[PDB]
Amino acid sequence: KEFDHPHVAKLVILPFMKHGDLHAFLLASRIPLQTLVRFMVDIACGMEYLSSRNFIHRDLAARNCMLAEDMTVCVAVKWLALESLADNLYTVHSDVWAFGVTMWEIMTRGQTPYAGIENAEIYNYLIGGNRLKQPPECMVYDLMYQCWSADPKQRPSFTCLRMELENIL
Numbered sequence: 001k002e003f004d005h006p007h008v009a010k011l012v013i014l015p016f017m018k019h020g021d022l023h024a025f026l027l028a029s030r031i032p033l034q035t036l037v038r039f040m041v042d043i044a045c046g047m048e049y050l051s052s053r054n055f056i057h058r059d060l061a062a063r064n065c066m067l068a069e070d071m072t073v074c075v076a077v078k079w080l081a082l083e084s085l086a087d088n089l090y091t092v093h094s095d096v097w098a099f100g101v102t103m104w105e106i107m108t109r110g111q112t113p114y115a116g117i118e119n120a121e122i123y124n125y126l127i128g129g130n131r132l133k134q135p136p137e138c139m140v141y142d143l144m145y146q147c148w149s150a151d152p153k154q155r156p157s158f159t160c161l162r163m164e165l166e167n168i169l
């Protein structure tokens, strides 16, 4: 883990991050569409770097992304792909799933995905063709929705995700 990218947490023994994790942060602010999308580009650059080095993360979520003082985000069952729950299969494609849900957390400013649903009924709930809902006023919903295709080969790579997100400006 001698990785070095500005959207991947350095190994120093971790740096001190003035503004906390992105989850607690987004939660402080609830209790603009333009700052949230920048959050998403960051995590996507971070994730592009890791998967290029064939590092499979396995626990991507807002809680595990960190805001530095400059306010860039760096990357450090409710997030798990169909195939990770059913077959304990973890890949770039399930990491892409998790990002999808992180994209949703951001847009809900830190809501527990599938809030009124138990851990145990998410699978059943996901094979039903059901996904996380488009949050009240959200443009973006389409990209995160691709990230949760049943066929992991239809989920867009982190390079595509970043571009669709960078593009959206």
Ligand SMILES: COc1ccccc1CNc1ncc(C(=O)NCCCN2CCCC2=O)c(NC2CCCC2)n1
Residues within 6 Å of the ligand: 009, 010, 014, 015, 016, 017, 018, 019, 020, 021, 024, 025, 028, 063, 066, 075, 076
């Ligand atoms: C999780 O560990 C890390 C991973 C990657 C880089 C750095 C670290 C650890 N560094 C670090 N530095 C400052 C903090 C830290 O707490 N900073 C103060 C943040 C307080 N908040 C929360 C809402 C707004 C605010 O300013 C921290 N917190 C851990 C992470 C999640 C909960 C507790 N952690």
